[model samples]
Target: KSVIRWCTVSSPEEKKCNNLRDLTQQERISLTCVQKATYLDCIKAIANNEADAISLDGGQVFEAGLAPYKLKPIAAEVYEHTEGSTTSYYAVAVVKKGTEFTVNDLQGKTSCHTGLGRSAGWNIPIGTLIHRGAIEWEGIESGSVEQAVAKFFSASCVPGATIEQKLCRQCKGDPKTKCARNAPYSGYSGAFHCLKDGKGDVAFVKHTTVNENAPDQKDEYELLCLDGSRQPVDNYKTCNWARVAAHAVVARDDNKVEDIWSFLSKAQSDFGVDTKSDFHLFGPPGKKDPVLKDLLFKDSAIMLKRVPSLMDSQLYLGFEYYSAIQSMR
Candidate 1:
C-alpha cells in the first residue's frame, strides 16, 4: 500500500481525486493526484513514470498501448446492463427529434464532438462518414481531422480542436484558448450543451449523454441510426452508431493493479450514492459555477472490471475498430 500517483486530464477530476485522498487516508491504500491538460499528456506521464495510473478512453488507450512506453488497461469502468454486465457503451449521433436528417442526410450540417481524435466523437463517426462517402478520408490533411469536419459540417464545437486552429468556429468559448476543457464548451457535457443550446444540430457522443443532461425529458431527442433511420434516444442498444469499448485505468505493464482496486472497492463502500454516507464517491453534479457533471468517474458507472492480461490496444479495441483509429492518424 503505497501512495499511487493517479493522473487526471481534467481539473474537475483532479479536484475529485484530491478529495478521495482524504477519504481513503485512513485506509491501507492512497492516491496522489497528478493533473494533465489532455489524454496524450496522461499517457506520456505514465511512460515517464511521472504518474502511476490514468483512466483513458478507448482511442487514447490505443495510442498509449503502443511502443516506447507500452501501457495496458488495468481496470475498466463497468456499467449496469439488463443482460449481465458490460464493459462497453454505445456511441450515438444525438439529434433533436424534429430535425430533418439521417445517416444519408448528414452532410453540411452543424455538429458537436467530445474532442478531435477521441473515440465516439471523432474516429467512429469520421470513419463511418468515410464509408458513406460523406468525407474523403484519404485526402484529409494530416493532423487536421477537425478542419475536414469543419468543411463537412456547417459548424461544430470540437473541444481542443483549436490545437490545429479554426476547429472551434462554432464554440461559444474563446477560440483563442484552443477551446481547451476550461472553455465553456468542451468534453462530453460541453458537446451535448452545444446541441442543447441550439449551437449545433447533432452531437456525436456516447448514448448516456442526453440521459445525464436531460434525464427527465429524454423523449425530446432521437438517435440518428446508421441504417438511414432514427430511433428514440433510450433505444440506443439497437439504434446506436456503434458499441465503443469502455474507458479504463491504465498503468505501466509491470505496475500493481491490485493496489488501486483495493482502495476503489473500499471507497465505493463508504462514498457511493447508495451508501448515502459521507463522500459522494459516485455523486451528482455541482450546482453552481464550473458545474462538473462527471468527476473522477463517469457518473453512471457502477464498478470497474478487470482487463485481460497481455491485451494490447488492437486486441482490446477489436481489429475493425483499431483500424479506424489508425486510418485517422
Candidate 2:
C-alpha cells in the first residue's frame, strides 16, 4: 500500500486530514496526516520526505520553491468568478470614492493591508510600486523592504509588521496584540474595516473584499488603477495591480506530481461539497470552531485543478509577482 503523508499546520487541520484519511481508507487511497507548528515547518517536513504534501498560500508557495526545498505545486484551488471558475484572483487598491489620488499619487498616506507577506495585501501592492519605481527598495542586503514601506507611508496598519511602530499605528488591537496576525486590523475583513472606519487612506486587499464585507457601501469606495486612474470598486478586473494565483497543494520536486493530483482529484470527487458524504473536502466539519474553518483547504475553494508544466513557485506566481517577491529579498 502506497501511503501519502500530508503535513498539517495545526491540530484542527490534522483532525480534518485524519477524517479525510478515514473516508478515503475504503477507497484504497492511503494517507497519513503529520502535524506541524507552522507552514514553514511543514515545508521542511515535505522536503525531508517526512511528509508528502500540503496546500499553501501563494506567498508560502514562493518560499517552498526556493533553494533547498524546491517544492512544486501539483494542483491549484479553484474559486467562483463571474467569468467562471478561476485559478486566480485580482489584487486591488481601494480608497474612498472622493479621494483625489490615483495609484501613483500615494505617498505619506495611511494604508491598510491584510497581512505582512500576503499576496494581495503585501506582495502585489508593494511589488507593483517597486516595479513602477514608485518606491525605492534596495533589496534585502542593504535594507529591509518594511523600512522602505514605512518611509513611503506616514502611518499604516500592516498586520505582522510588528517591528515598525509606524506601520502598527493605525491598528486597533490592544497594546500587546497590535500588529499581530490576530490584531483588529488584520486580514481582508480587518483591512477593509480599517478603510471603512476612516483610519486608513487606502486598503490593499483582494478584489472581492469590499463587496463581501460591505456590499451596501461599495459605491462609496473606488479601485486605484495602475494607469493612474480610479474606477468603481466593481472594475477590479481592469484596475487591479496584479492577478494572484490561487492556493495550491505543494510537494517535493522529485515527487510524482501526477500521483498527488490523482489523490486530490479522488478525494475532492468523493468528499467535495457537491457530494452527499458526511465529509466536506473544502469546508470545516459541522461545528462552531472558528479556528477550524479553512482546514486542509479554503472553504471558498470550489474545486482543485491539475497544475501543468512550470509547476514551481516561480512559474505558479508568474513573472511579475515572482519578480516582486524577489525584489523584497
Candidate 3:
C-alpha cells in the first residue's frame, strides 16, 4: 500500500486534490494531502522534500525550476478559473494618484515588488514593464520598507542630478553613483508599506490586488498603461492576452518514465470521469467566451493521448493515450 502524497496552493488546490484523492482511493490507492499557503511555498516544499510533489501552474513550475527534482507532470493542462476571457491577466504597475509621470517616467523611480516566482504576481508584470521601457530590472537586494524609504528621500535631496535621472543612471550602471539608486526587493511581502511610506514611487501588483479589497486600497492610485493611453475605467479595463493551462500529478523516483505516463493516463480519465467535478474554466465566466473553454477541453483530451508517447519516445504524441484508455475494457 504505497502512499501518494499531494500538495497544492490555496483552497482551490485543496478542493481539486480531495476530489482526485477520492477517485484514486476508488482505484485502491492510499493518499495524503498537504496544503501550502502560496504557489511558491508549494513548489519549495517539493524541492525541499517537505512534500512529495505539488499541483501547480506550468509557467510557475518552469519559473521555479522544479524539473531538477524530477517532479514529473501527470495530468494535462487545465486552466484555473479567473476573471476574463483568458486565464492570463496583466500585472499592473501602479502609483499614487496625482503623480505627473507617465509609464515611461517610471524608469528611474524606486520600484517595489511583492516577491518572486509568481507568474501574474511578478514575472509577467515586470517583463511587461521592462518591455515598455518603463523600468529596468535591478539586481536582488534585502531591506525593509522603512530603510528603502529613507534611502529614497535622501537620494532625492542630493545635489546635481534629479532623483529620477540619478536612479535611472544608477540602474544603468553609472560609475560615480554612491547610494543604491534602484531597490530590488521581493514581491511576496511588505511591498505595500514601501509604496504607502513613500519608499517606492512604483510597485508591481496583481490586477486583483487593486480592487476594492486591497490593503493599500487608494481611490487615487493610477494604473500605468503600456501604450501611454488613458487609463480605462475600472469596469472596462481590458487587456488582450491568451490563456494557458497547468495540470498536476505525482510520480515516483524509480522508473519515472513509465510511472509518469501511467499517472497521466489515470489522472486524465479521473479528471474527465466526473464531468460535474472536472469542469474547469479557462478564463473569467461570461457569455460567449468559448475560445478558452474549447481550448481547455480539446487540449486536455489531446494531452491524455500523449501519455504512451511520453513513455517510449521523446517525440510527438497525438492524444492516442486518451483514445486507447477510453477504449480500455
Candidate 4:
C-alpha cells in the first residue's frame, strides 16, 4: 500500500508534524519527511508530488494557484473564533492605544511588516495605504518598491527587504543580516513584537494577533480603520482592513486528493483542541509557544474542510486583493 507523505518547511514544523505518525491503521499513513528551505519551495514540491500536503498561508495560497505550478485549494482551514467558523480572517493595521496618530498620519512613522511578500504584512497594508491616500510613491527612484517604501516611512522592518537596509532599520535582527526575513521579529507575531518591543509605531497583521500575544494588555492596542477611525480590537470584523482567504492544503490533481481528506479527517477525530488524546493530524508536537506557532497547520484552525474542485483560490481571495499583491510585485 502506498503511504501518505507530507512536507514541512522548517525544523520546528517538521518536529510538530509527527504527532499523527502512528495513528493510521498499522502506520499506513507513515510520515515521509521532505524539508524545504522556504515556504515557496514546499508548494513547488507538492505541485510535483514530491510530498503529499503542505498547508499554506494566504499569500502562499495565491502563489500556489498561479503560474506554471497551477495548484488548487483541495482543503481549507476553518477558523473557530469567527462567528460562524468562517474559513477566512481579517487583516488590519494596528497601533498603540492613546496614540494621537490616525490612518492619515501613517506617513513618516516607523512601520513594522510581517514580511515583504506576505498579504497582511505588505500587500493589504500597502494597498490600503495607497488607496486611502496615506502615502504616495511620488518621485521615487526607478519605481523601486523598496525605494518608495524607504522614502515614505522614516524606517521599517519589512522582513524580506534583504537588499535594502533602510527598510530593515527598525527590525530587531542580527546586525550582519540587518533585519532580514529570518530575523526573530518577522511574520505576524514577530511584526507585532516589532511594535511591542518599541521598534515601530505601526504594525500590520491579522486581527487575533494582539489577543494571542498581548492578552493582558490587549486594550492597549487598536485597529486603524480605513476611515481614519480607531476601534477597539474586538471590533476587527467591522472597523478593519480587508478579509482574506484562509490558508489551505494543496495536493496534486489526482486520486490521492481523496486520501488527503480521509486521512486527516481521522486524525482530526483523534486529536484536536478539546480532545485529551495526544495525537492530532493537525497539531504540533512541541508545547512551547512561538517555537511551534504554526507547524503542520495554522494554529488558529479548528478543522480542515474539503473545498469544491470549482473553487479557485484567486477568485476566492477576490480580484482586487490579488491585484494589490500583483501590483506590488
- Most lDDT-accurate candidate: 2
Which TM-score value belongs to model 4? 0.70
Model 4 weakest lDDT span, ten residues long: 131-140
Candidates sorted by TM-score, descending order? 2, 4, 1, 3
Per-residue C-alpha lDDT of model 1 across residues 196-288, encoded as one tens digit per residue:
889888998887889888998897899998888899988998787666677777788774667766666777767765776556765554434
lDDT comparing candidate 3 with the true structure? 0.43
Candidate 3 per-residue lDDT, tens place, 55-129, comes to 344354343433455444444443343431222334565667777776555545666555432444344544444
**Better by TM-score, candidate 4 or 3:** 4
Off by over 4 Å in 1: 1-3, 8-39, 79-89, 94-123, 131-134, 139-143, 146-224, 227-234, 284-287, 291-293, 315-323
For candidate 1, the TM-score is 0.63
Cα lDDT computed for each candidate against the true fold: 0.75, 0.84, 0.43, 0.76
Comparing 2 with 4 on lDDT, the higher-scoring candidate is 2
Provide TM-scores for the models: 0.63, 0.84, 0.42, 0.70
Which portions of model 3 show Cα errors greater than 4 Å? Answer: 1-54, 63-89, 116-122, 129-190, 212-219, 230-329
Q: Which candidate tops TM-score?
A: 2
